[PDB]
Amino acid sequence: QAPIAAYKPRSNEILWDGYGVPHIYGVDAPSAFYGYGWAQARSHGDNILRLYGEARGKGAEYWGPDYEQTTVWLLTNGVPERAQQWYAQQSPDFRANLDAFAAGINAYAQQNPDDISPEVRQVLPVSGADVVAHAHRLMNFLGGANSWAVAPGKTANGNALLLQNPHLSWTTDYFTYYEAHLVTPDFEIYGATQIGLPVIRFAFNQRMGITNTVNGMVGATNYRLTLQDGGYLYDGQVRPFERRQASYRLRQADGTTVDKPLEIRSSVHGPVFERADGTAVAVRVAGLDRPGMLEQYFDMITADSFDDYEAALARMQVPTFNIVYADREGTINYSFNGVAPKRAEGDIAFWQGLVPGDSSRYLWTETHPLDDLPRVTNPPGGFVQNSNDPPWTPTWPVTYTPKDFPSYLAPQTPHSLRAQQSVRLMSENDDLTLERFMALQLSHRAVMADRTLPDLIPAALIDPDPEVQAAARLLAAWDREFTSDSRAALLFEEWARLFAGQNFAGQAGFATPWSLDKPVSTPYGVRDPKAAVDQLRTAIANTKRKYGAIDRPFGDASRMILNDVNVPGAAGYGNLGSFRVFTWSDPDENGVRTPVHGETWVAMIEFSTPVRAYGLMSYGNSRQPGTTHYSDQIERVSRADFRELLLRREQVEAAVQERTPFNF
Ligand SMILES: [Ca+2]
């Protein structure tokens, strides 16, 4: 009935498990934020300090030419200054949490100076504003993911299920996910978030949890300016620019710095940039007046009820993202979230291109409230999903159509085959257990082979080239599954690179086009079989060149390699239909390839009492030099051997490998 008793921390301590996951126990909120700062510094200190330095607008100053473009970009958009403003604009309670987090970082570095790379030492001390600045850069001035939520009625046990499944870069520093656990007398949060963020974006606890995917919210407008007589033409008149003289320091090879002038020009729209070709472009970013994004996430993930959650969401301080919610009470929700300008005309394509910058006709000033955006709560189908598809099949049966919303909010483009799989996997299954839920997450179907091979194979068999004939039989015998042992998968990928373009998203070659009326079974067929066979001819050559043969085992070429761990790969490209994603790189000279992005933080939660959750982090929980917690999870990933996620104090106590008492 009621959830299990909340644990009441009586001292400040971090209990680390064997995988380098910190369980931070604090006697109050600032204590927990401090411990969290300390832990992030231990696990990712170098890259966090680097990023904070950048978000200060001091990249060029600290590290020279390689960081200058970012410095100019951030200074022109007034990011470091706005962060100082946002910091002061925090509620006093949340500002104290931000101060504590920054102090935790500083105290870690103070106590462990040997753990801090020489190049980033100059960044210290960090402040609450630094924290705010980085979050500002990340959200407003910087892939893929899956998301599932399942309602009780669709499960065997009667408890909601949740999937957290972002697919960002395995290398990009600011996209590094970190797993942590925060406990105070008043709240509990478990999950993953980008390094440097003091709040957990992919969070769950005993009561509730959320996950995120990219929706590509069009939160900015690029205005083409008409330059005339030193100014710009606007409503038939020439307006002079706002001009501000700024400057920044650039580190030289000899370790000195040089002062570089930077004039920031602004039109009524926003700051002005000149492009390569010579187009003067004013950039107008929505939601610059929304200082509460971090606290919004915090209030969302510590909500005592769905009503409280929705009230926090409705603040409109989080500028983008599809956000999916589930709780132990049994509510599931999908929200197409972001800060979207109210506009009187124009579809999404119009607002994504260069918009005329000569007229107040196109100057928006207001943004949509939450109730104007596509949302689904407890739908008849008993699930919600999003795999970066436009928000038109978030559940099945659908509860709204594209007509119900302004045409500028979201595209109406063909749903990817991964997204089609996502809908099929949830809709086609009933009486789900957590085990089965987890099994479905591993899906790696070559859906595009289902759509194309029935037409391609017979066409290829009539080609006079015996090697093309053999290729057809190889593809024909394939079970259309991206398994390690597959001898046809690599060849099929190579054919698809031609048939459907290098991103596998091309549509022109299908016989039957995509249709929202058949959203999980179109597009289908091969429009021009003869042409497709010539593509296979080329693909055969490409496969042999890249991999050495047309039938090399998929998991022999596709490897997951971190430090000295080298394990076989399975699953693949989302746009080919693989739900579980590994975006394999181009191969090296031996035909070996590894994931550029794909599965990173993967968690599956059942809101039973107590909750039960399993997860993995592909690239471990630390990237600091010398850590044992970088390559220590990837072998488990290769076997889909998920860790039980430990939220209960006694579970944490049984798993502890390191104890860090702390003071605040
Ligand atoms: Ca150390």
Per-residue three-class SS string for 121-154: HHHCCCCHHHHHHHHHHHHHCCCCEEEEEECHHH
Nearest-angstrom CA–CA distance, 500 and 609 = 47
Residues 6 or more apart in contact with residue 69 via CB below 8 angstroms: none
Nearest-angstrom CA–CA distance, 206 and 84 = 35
Method: X-ray
Tell me how far the alpha carbon of residue 121 lies from the centroid of ligand 1, in angstroms.
Answer: 15
Question: 59: helix, coil or strand?
Answer: helix
Exposed e or buried b per residue across 367-376, where buried means at least 16 C-beta atoms within 10 angstroms of its C-beta: bbebeebbbb
Sheet holding 658-661, edge to edge: 375-377, 332-336, 322-327, 208-213, 202-204, 188-194, 177-183, 22-25, 13-16, 658-661
Instruction: List the structure tokens of 465.
Output: 């080239």
Tell me how far the alpha carbon of residue 564 lies from the centroid of ligand 1, in angstroms.
Answer: 22
Task: Centre a 10 Å sphere on the Cβ of residue 591 and count the other Cβ atoms it contains.
Answer: 18
Tell me how far the alpha carbon of residue 42 lies from the centroid of ligand 1, in angstroms.
Answer: 8
Nearest-angstrom CA–CA distance, 243 and 534 = 58
Q: Of 487, 490, 530, which Cα lies nearest the Cα of 511?
A: 530
Tell me the DSSP string of 98-127.
HHHHHHHHHHHHHH-GGGS-GGGGGGPSP-
Tell me how far the alpha carbon of residue 129 lies from the centroid of ligand 1, in angstroms.
Answer: 27
Tell me how far the alpha carbon of residue 617 lies from the centroid of ligand 1, in angstroms.
Answer: 23
Pairing mode of beta strands 220-224, 354-356: parallel
Tell me how far the alpha carbon of residue 171 lies from the centroid of ligand 1, in angstroms.
Answer: 23
Tell me how far the alpha carbon of residue 112 lies from the centroid of ligand 1, in angstroms.
Answer: 6
Question: 614: helix, coil or strand?
Answer: strand
Cα torsion 382, 385, 389, 390 to 10°: value is: 50
Beta bridge partners of 223: 282, 355
E strand or H helix at 539, and its extent?
helix 529-547
Residue/partner pairs of 266-270 with CB below 8 Å, 24 or more apart: 266/241, 266/242, 267/223, 267/225, 267/232, 267/234, 267/239, 267/241, 267/242, 267/357, 268/234, 268/239, 268/363, 269/221, 269/223, 269/357, 269/363, 270/223
Tell me how far the alpha carbon of residue 109 lies from the centroid of ligand 1, in angstroms.
Answer: 10
Nearest-angstrom CA–CA distance, 382 and 427 = 8
Residues 6 or more apart in contact with residue 344 via CB below 8 angstroms: none
Tell me how far the alpha carbon of residue 106 lies from the centroid of ligand 1, in angstroms.
Answer: 14
Tell the CATH topology of 46-143. Penicillin Amidohydrolase; domain 1 (1.10.439)
Q: What is the CA radius of gyration of the chain?
A: 26
Residues carrying CATH 1.10.439.10, the chain: 46-143
Residues carrying CATH 3.60.20.10, the chain: 1-45+146-216+286-443+595-655
Q: Are 537 and 499 in contact (CB under 8 A)?
A: no
Task: Centre a 10 Å sphere on the Cβ of residue 292 and count the other Cβ atoms it contains.
Answer: 19
Tell me how far the alpha carbon of residue 600 lies from the centroid of ligand 1, in angstroms.
Answer: 26
Tell me how far the alpha carbon of residue 661 lies from the centroid of ligand 1, in angstroms.
Answer: 15
Q: Are 149 and 322 in contact (CB under 8 A)?
A: no
Q: What architecture (CATH level 2) is domain 221-285?
A: Roll (2.30)
Q: Are 504 and 497 in contact (CB under 8 A)?
A: yes
Residues carrying CATH 1.10.1400.10, the chain: 444-594
Tell me how far the alpha carbon of residue 31 lies from the centroid of ligand 1, in angstroms.
Answer: 22
Tell me how far the alpha carbon of residue 50 lies from the centroid of ligand 1, in angstroms.
Answer: 19
Q: Are 525 and 455 in contact (CB under 8 A)?
A: yes
Residues 6 or more apart in contact with residue 449 via CB below 8 angstroms: 475, 478, 480, 492, 576, 577
Q: What architecture (CATH level 2) is domain 1-45+146-216+286-443+595-655?
A: 4-Layer Sandwich (3.60)
Tell me how far the alpha carbon of residue 115 lies from the centroid of ligand 1, in angstroms.
Answer: 5
Nearest-angstrom CA–CA distance, 526 and 453 = 8
Tell me how far the alpha carbon of residue 104 lies from the centroid of ligand 1, in angstroms.
Answer: 15
Tell me how far the alpha carbon of residue 38 lies from the centroid of ligand 1, in angstroms.
Answer: 12
Tell me how far the alpha carbon of residue 602 lies from the centroid of ligand 1, in angstroms.
Answer: 28
Q: What architecture (CATH level 2) is domain 444-594?
A: Orthogonal Bundle (1.10)
E strand or H helix at 417, and its extent?
helix 417-427
Nearest-angstrom CA–CA distance, 400 and 465 = 51
Tell me how far the alpha carbon of residue 117 lies from the centroid of ligand 1, in angstroms.
Answer: 12
Tell me how far the alpha carbon of residue 116 lies from the centroid of ligand 1, in angstroms.
Answer: 9
Residues 6 or more apart in contact with residue 384 via CB below 8 angstroms: 147, 148, 149, 324, 332, 333, 334, 376, 394, 395
Residue/partner pairs of 646-649 with CB below 8 Å, 24 or more apart: 646/17, 646/23, 646/181, 647/181, 647/188, 647/190, 647/205, 647/206, 647/610, 647/611, 647/613, 648/4, 648/7, 648/610, 649/7
Tell me how far the alpha carbon of residue 199 lies from the centroid of ligand 1, in angstroms.
Answer: 25
Q: Of 432, 433, 423, which Cα lies nearest the Cα of 394?
A: 423
Tell me how far the alpha carbon of residue 111 lies from the centroid of ligand 1, in angstroms.
Answer: 9
Tell me how far the alpha carbon of residue 100 lies from the centroid of ligand 1, in angstroms.
Answer: 21
Tell me how far the alpha carbon of residue 646 lies from the centroid of ligand 1, in angstroms.
Answer: 25
Tell me the DSSP string of 286-325.
TTTT-TTHHHHHHHHHT-SSHHHHHHHHTT--S-S-EEEE
E strand or H helix at 544, and its extent?
helix 529-547
Nearest-angstrom CA–CA distance, 421 and 412 = 18
Residue type, 259: D
Tell me how far the alpha carbon of residue 517 lies from the centroid of ligand 1, in angstroms.
Answer: 58
Tell me how far the alpha carbon of residue 44 lies from the centroid of ligand 1, in angstroms.
Answer: 12
Tell me how far the alpha carbon of residue 60 lies from the centroid of ligand 1, in angstroms.
Answer: 29
Tell me how far the alpha carbon of residue 14 lies from the centroid of ligand 1, in angstroms.
Answer: 15
Nearest-angstrom CA–CA distance, 159 and 608 = 5
Tell me how far the alpha carbon of residue 258 lies from the centroid of ligand 1, in angstroms.
Answer: 35
Q: Are 422 and 581 in contact (CB under 8 A)?
A: no
Tell me how far the alpha carbon of residue 660 lies from the centroid of ligand 1, in angstroms.
Answer: 12
Tell me how far the alpha carbon of residue 32 lies from the centroid of ligand 1, in angstroms.
Answer: 21
Cα→Cα distances 558→442, 532, 620, Å: 17, 26, 19
Tell me how far the alpha carbon of residue 40 lies from the centroid of ligand 1, in angstroms.
Answer: 13
Q: Of 289, 348, 344, which Cα lies nearest the Cα of 315?
A: 289
| Residue the block writes with tokens 């070429």 | 557
Residues carrying CATH 2.30.120.10, the chain: 221-285
Nearest-angstrom CA–CA distance, 205 and 220 = 34
Data resolution in angstroms: 2.2
Tell me how far the alpha carbon of residue 624 lies from the centroid of ligand 1, in angstroms.
Answer: 10
Nearest-angstrom CA–CA distance, 177 and 211 = 13
Beta bridge partners of 445: 481
Beta bridge partners of 614: 604, 644
Residues with CB under 5 A from ligand 1 (ion): 112, 115
Q: Are 621 and 178 in contact (CB under 8 A)?
A: yes
Question: 375: helix, coil or strand?
Answer: strand
